[PDB]
Amino acid sequence: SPGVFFDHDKGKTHASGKLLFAARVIPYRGSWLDFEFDAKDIVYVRIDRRRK
DNA sequence: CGTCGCGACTCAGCGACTCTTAATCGAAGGTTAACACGATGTTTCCCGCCTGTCAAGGGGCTAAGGGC
């Protein structure tokens, strides 16, 4: 369904054991947006999972 | 007697091939300037050569009947 999503990572793709909390808003028709974090504790706008 | 001028260093990071094994039924939707000679094939009959009938004629071979 269209709307913002916050998929907290379950440890996978983490530095050691930390979570990611990828805040992604899925539009009904358009380009996806990802506001996930990293091990450096920084929010990166991974638009449509292309770049970070 | 300190650092920094100047060097590697491994750490991260970024890209990327497969989804068993047989099977349940066959195809599958759009895109919308106008015209002109020329050289280039396309398609029809038309005679040329030749092929394939059956027949006609005949003879030559084979065989069957009659006579001594």
Curated annotation (Swiss-Prot):
It comes from the Bacteria. Signal peptide: none annotated. Disulfide bonds: none annotated. DNA-dependent RNA polymerase catalyzes the transcription of DNA into RNA using the four ribonucleoside triphosphates as substrates. Belongs to the RNA polymerase beta chain family. The RNAP catalytic core consists of 2 alpha, 1 beta, 1 beta' and 1 omega subunit. When a sigma factor is associated with the core the holoenzyme is formed, which can initiate transcription. This is DNA-directed RNA polymerase subunit beta. It comes from Caulobacter vibrioides (strain NA1000 / CB15N) (Caulobacter crescentus). The lineage of its organism: Bacteria, Pseudomonadati, Pseudomonadota, Alphaproteobacteria, Caulobacterales. The chain holds residues 158 to 209 of 1356 of the full protein.
